[PDB]
Amino acid sequence: KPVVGVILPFSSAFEDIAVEQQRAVELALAESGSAFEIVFKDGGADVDTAVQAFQDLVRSQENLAAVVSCSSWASSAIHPLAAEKDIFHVAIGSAALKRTEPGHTIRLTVGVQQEQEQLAAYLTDFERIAVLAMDNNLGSSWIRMLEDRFPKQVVAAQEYNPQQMDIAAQLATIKARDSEALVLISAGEAATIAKQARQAGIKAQLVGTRPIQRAEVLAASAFTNGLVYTYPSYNQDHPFMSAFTDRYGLEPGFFGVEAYDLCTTLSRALEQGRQTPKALFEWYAGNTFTGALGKVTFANDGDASYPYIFKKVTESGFRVAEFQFPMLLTQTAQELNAIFKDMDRSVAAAAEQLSTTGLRGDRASAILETLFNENQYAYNCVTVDATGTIVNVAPKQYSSVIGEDISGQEQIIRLHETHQPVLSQAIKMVEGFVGIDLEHPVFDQDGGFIGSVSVLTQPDFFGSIISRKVHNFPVEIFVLQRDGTTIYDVNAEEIGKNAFAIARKMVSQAEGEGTYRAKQLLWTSIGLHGTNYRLALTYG
Ligand X SMILES: CC(C)CC(=O)C(=O)O
Ligand Y SMILES: Nc1ccnc(=O)[nH]1
Sequence ranges of the binding site for Ca(2+): 282, 285, 287
Going across the sheet that includes 512-516, the strands are 486-488, 475-480, 531-539, 519-528, 512-516
Minimal CB distance to ligand Y: which residue? Answer: 429
Among 37, 46, 431, 476, indicate the residue that binds ligand Y (CB under 6 A): 431
Q: Cβ closer to Ca ion: 117 or 282?
A: 282
Among 540, 22, 522, smallest CA distance to 255 is for: 22
Q: What's the min distance (Å) between Cβ of 232 and ligand Y?
A: 45
CB atoms near residue 532 (< 10 Å): 15
Work out how close the CB of 457 gets to ligand Y at its nearest, in angstroms, rounded to a whole number: 10
Site string for Ca ion, 277-316 (x = CB under 5 A): -----x--xxx-----------------------------
Number of residues lying near ligand Y (CB under 6 A): 10
Binding residues: 282, 285, 287, 409, 430-431
Strand order in the sheet with 378-385: 390-394, 378-385, 449-457, 437-443, 422-423
The single-letter DSSP state of residue 511 is S
Cα–Cα distance for residue pair 524/315, rounded to 1 Å = 32
Nearest distance from C-beta of residue 386 to ligand Y, angstroms: 15
Does 406 bind ligand Y (CB under 6 A)? Our answer is: yes
Instruction: Considering the complex, state which of residue 123 and residue 391 has its C-beta at the smaller distance from ligand Y.
Output: 391
Residue nearest to ligand X (CB): 72
Of 21, 94, 209, 380, the one binding ligand Y (CB under 6 A) is 380
Distances (CA, A) of 339 to 121, 326, 346: 18, 20, 11
Contact by Cβ (8 Å): 278, 285 = no
CA distance 261 to 110: 14
User: By rule CB under 6 A, what string of x and - marks binding of each residue 411-430 to ligand Y?
Assistant: ------------------xx
3-state secondary structure at position 523 = strand
Smallest gap, in angstroms, from Cβ of residue 155 to ligand X?
25
- Residues 208, 421: Cα–Cα separation, whole Å: 47
Question: Binding residues for ligand X, per CB under 6 A?
Answer: 9, 14, 17, 70-72, 93-96, 109, 138, 187, 211
Query: Checking DSSP bridges between strand 304-305 and strand 308-314, what pairing results, if any?
Result: unpaired
153 binds, among ligand X, ligand Y, Ca ion, none (CB under 5 to 8 A by kind): none
When the beta carbons of 71 and 118 are compared against ligand X, the nearer one is 71
Q: Which residues bind ligand Y (CB under 6 A)?
A: 380, 382, 406, 409, 429-431, 437, 454, 456
